[PDB]
Design a protein around this nucleic acid. Sequence first.
DNA 1: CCTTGGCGGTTAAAACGCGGGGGACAGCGCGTACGTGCGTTTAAGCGGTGCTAGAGCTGTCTACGACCAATTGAGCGGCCTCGGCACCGGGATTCTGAT
Length: 213
Amino acid sequence: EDNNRIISRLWRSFRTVKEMAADRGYFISQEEMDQSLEEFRSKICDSMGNPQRKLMSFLANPTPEALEKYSDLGTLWVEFCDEPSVGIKTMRNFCLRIQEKNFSTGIFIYQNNITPSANKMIPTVSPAIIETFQESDLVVNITHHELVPKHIRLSDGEKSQLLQRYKLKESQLPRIQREDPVARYLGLKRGQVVKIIRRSETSGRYASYRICL
DNA sequence: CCTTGGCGGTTAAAACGCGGGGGACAGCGCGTACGTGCGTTTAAGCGGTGCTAGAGCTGTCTACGACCAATTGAGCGGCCTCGGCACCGGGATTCTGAT
């Protein structure tokens, strides 16, 4: 019944999180990619069937290609929290643990809401980075949608090459919001440029560039 | 877009409760201090007898204090500056209890 639906949605969200991490450049084992609903239920659920969200929390390391390309790519921590509402307490613990093991980026997937008082600790936890996603948002991977073309973040050298080829300043580029679902999915920081190749009915293929604010 | 009125979120201080451990209470038993009494004694009290030191009173002389002009500088009000430590971050000491 509804327990099956909850478990299935959670498994879909976990698969989306792993696809997000692999897309961003971290190495994920090919076997944990193909995690199936029943095998996930075996490794996560209980005798009563309700799931322990504390076992999904994993650790991701940069693939060597995404290290040679994105030199600023550190080590990733991904946590599925158990408290539906998340307050300043839980964010304090999460930030303490992230800084405690010098994790560069900490993804904090929550269920119901993250309160503004807690929300204020997200930017004040330098040099680590904390991002949050809601589980309801992660059920579908939106980069698989047909209307969403593939976004690829540029490296610093290629961004410089792009700016010099067009004799451009950063403010004279098309823009993408930091809160954009595909910028949010990609972990774009201010000043970084994605490249968006897309279908063109007049030319076949067209490359677009946006800078994240 | 500007103005104002709710329900949450977070801080901070405070009852309920659950185990829990020890302490006032009551009882039992033992010890000896003192009330009650008896035998013996002398110093406080009554009543005199006498001797005397000094405070109340009076008197006399007076000088420091009350009162009233003049005088002036430290006391008082308003600012200006800077270091001891309450609190914070972090490590070494030390009870403290179960074993």
